Design a protein around this nucleic acid. Sequence first.
RNA 1: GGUUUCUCUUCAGAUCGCAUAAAUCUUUCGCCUUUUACUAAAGAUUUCCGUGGAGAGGAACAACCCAAUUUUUUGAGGCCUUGCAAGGCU
Lengths: 81, 104, 74, 82, 111
Amino acid sequence: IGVPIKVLHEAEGHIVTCETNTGEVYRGKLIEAEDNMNCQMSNITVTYRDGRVAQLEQVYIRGSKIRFLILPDMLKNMLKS
Amino acid sequence: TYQRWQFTLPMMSTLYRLANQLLTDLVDDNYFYLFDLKAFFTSKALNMAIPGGPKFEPLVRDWNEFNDINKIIIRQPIRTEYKIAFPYLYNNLPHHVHLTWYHT
Amino acid sequence: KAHPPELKKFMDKKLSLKLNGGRHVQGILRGFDPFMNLVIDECVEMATSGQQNNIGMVVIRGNSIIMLEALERV
Amino acid sequence: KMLQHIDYRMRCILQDGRIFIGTFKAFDKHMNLILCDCDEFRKIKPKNSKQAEREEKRVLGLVLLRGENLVSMTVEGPPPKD
Amino acid sequence: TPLYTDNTANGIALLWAPRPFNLRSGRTRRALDIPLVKNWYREHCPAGQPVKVRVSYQKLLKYYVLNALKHRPPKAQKKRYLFRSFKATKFFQSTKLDWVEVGLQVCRQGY
RNA sequence: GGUUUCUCUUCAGAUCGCAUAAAUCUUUCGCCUUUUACUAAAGAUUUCCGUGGAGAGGAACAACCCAAUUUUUUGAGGCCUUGCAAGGCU
């Protein structure tokens, strides 16, 4: 199991930002993160490629189709590695 | 120099079996409830003697309402064992008193 | 490993599915496997025109699943 | 070869052509990367462009990038001491 | 592995044994520094014993309590070795003798 | 590179020692002609029988296996408009 993956699981319960492979940007609370990067989130704000926003209560995104995630800066500050 | 030893466990069981005439048959500590060192220290400090225990020389060497006999409900007497056991409760002036292990 | 996706929470709920190709469908989750292939019942294709057409019970290959969104409360 | 550059500031190139610059703190089998104090650039990687060095810069912060979408990495600057 | 062996009941038996049996290893001790009866007087005197024996138990406990009270930890001093100083001289030679032989010499020399 | 075994130096915090002695002084006690020798509690200071850590020298014994979804064996390339970027495309 990978070092970044452990740090992701650590962000469960925190507000995170996710960009997909298609560039839609989802911000909200990370409920569950699976080993393969599958992500369950809640109370989302989504910002599309045209710039428009929307609001969603509940989402789940497949790990493969995630480009990246932004985690809380405070959480990062792993040391042993 | 013969300074350190380390034995295997069959050796220790053989020796333990062969030595049992000189050894105690207690497994825990509660047998020495008011017979431990701390009880004897407290007893010496208060000038009181546990019935089996040693006796020493004393360490320390008016009309009042607080001590009056009409106010006392004599239900059980206060033994000396109780004063060893809870020394701050049953003694006026406990100096140089040790608290004893309560229970294991 | 050979893990399941954690989707039991979403079973028998109405969902909104974003697929690759800018494709979107809606339906009730009836089941899944470790590859995230889905069974979706009472499925409806949301055509880019805005028009929606009923396609019934269908299989979506997990490969081509971008995102899902619940239309219910879990 | 990866462990050497750990703790360093690193310029990472994505498959769409973005430039992620952050402190390289962790990686794994897939090359999923952990980037502290990370910013994103789009238009340029400056080599002292007299007009300006920085256009479309965005502050991101603590970033986990998936290795699928990574192309390449070069050393951008030394480790911050902190 | 089996659930138990021949050694298992004995090995469990040693967990609840009195010192020094409860250990596997240790430092060798001086012969005199092992009383071997200290536990007999640290218990209650058995019932029905005569008065002299009952009193005896109290006196042995008394000395036990006074050593434990009065103890202060050992002062770290410059040791000196008397016999090493004697052996460094040419006047003292060294040998290996029977204990009874040496004892007789001690008796004769004192006389 | 090791282990065992003697001598010396230095530092001791740790139940320095799962044991336990003596002496000196000051307080209180018991002995009661005076002094040895004493009775028994507290405190202070030494001696003695032992111990631990570190360092130096001598001697002895051994040895130079992953291309078929979730990542790394590809949905990979080609067309149109505006100021490479965005979008529409195939």
